[PDB]
Design a protein around this ligand. Structure first.
Ligand SMILES: O=[P-]([O-])[O-]
Length: 229
């Protein structure tokens, strides 16, 4: 039997401002820093340790990981930063206030853009300042693999290779793994782990900064899961 711990980044500036974020590299609020430290303290007091961690290339998740590491006295473990764990790409919605958007386009249209498993937000133009092509984070990524928008389906497809190629072999090698990531990239990973239907995944929400523990059997199939706290 194995344990895997997942954690969503603490409150970001745009979470506070109610803006769609996606791949925009915004940072934690004071609250979010607090949440991350509390999560690290909660794992420390429960006796968890880790041998490796996975995160995105986005600072809100990385700083969350840093606070956890600092509270646990785990500043030295290897960390794999992967674009594959980035938040779902919000396209031309990135940066817009969610309430303003719903007023302009309607509540239903926004709920389709936010939670339709299969229908993506309107795309960035390839010339937009928000596009990923000139960002050093993505300099070794095939141009054709870089998104201009994503639905959860695309996010699931992007997350899986990192699971199959790196995280699952670590878990099988006996490494105690922590994944510090994002609301929709953790929804996507959960969807895969728990074998959740396209319909059923629509109502799953992940709070900021709360450890989510998975117990996994010999074939890495979930036995049970629970939040700590
Ligand atoms: O707001 P977040 O889950 O990237």
């Amino acid at each position: 039997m194995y344990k895997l711990v997942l954690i969503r980044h603490g409150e970001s500036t745009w979470n506070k401002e109610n803006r769609f974020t996606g791949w925009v590299d915004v940072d934690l609020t004071e609250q979010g820093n607090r949440e991350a430290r509390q999560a690290g303290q909660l794992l420390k007091e429960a006796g968890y340790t880790f041998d490796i961690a996975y995160t995105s290339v986005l600072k809100r998740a990385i700083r969350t990981l840093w606070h956890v590491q600092d509270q646990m006295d785990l500043m030295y473990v290897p960390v794999v930063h992967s674009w594959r764990l980035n938040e779902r790409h919000y396209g031309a919605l990135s940066g817009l206030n969610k309430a303003e958007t719903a007023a302009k386009y309607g509540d239903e249209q926004v709920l389709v853009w936010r939670r339709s498993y299969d229908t993506p937000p309107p795309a960035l133009e390839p010339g937009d300042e928000r596009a990923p092509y000139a960002d050093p984070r993505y300099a070794k990524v095939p141009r054709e693999q870089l998104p201009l928008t994503e639905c959860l389906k695309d996010t699931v497809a992007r997350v899986l290779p990192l699971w199959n190629e790196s995280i699952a072999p670590a878990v099988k090698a006996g490494k105690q793994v922590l994944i510090a990531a994002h609301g929709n990239s953790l929804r996507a990973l959960i969807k895969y782990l728990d074998g959740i239907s396209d319909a059923d995944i629509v109502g799953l929400n992940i709070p900021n900064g709360v450890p989510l523990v998975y117990e996994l059997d010999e074939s890495l199939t979930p036995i049970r899961h629970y939040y700590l706290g």
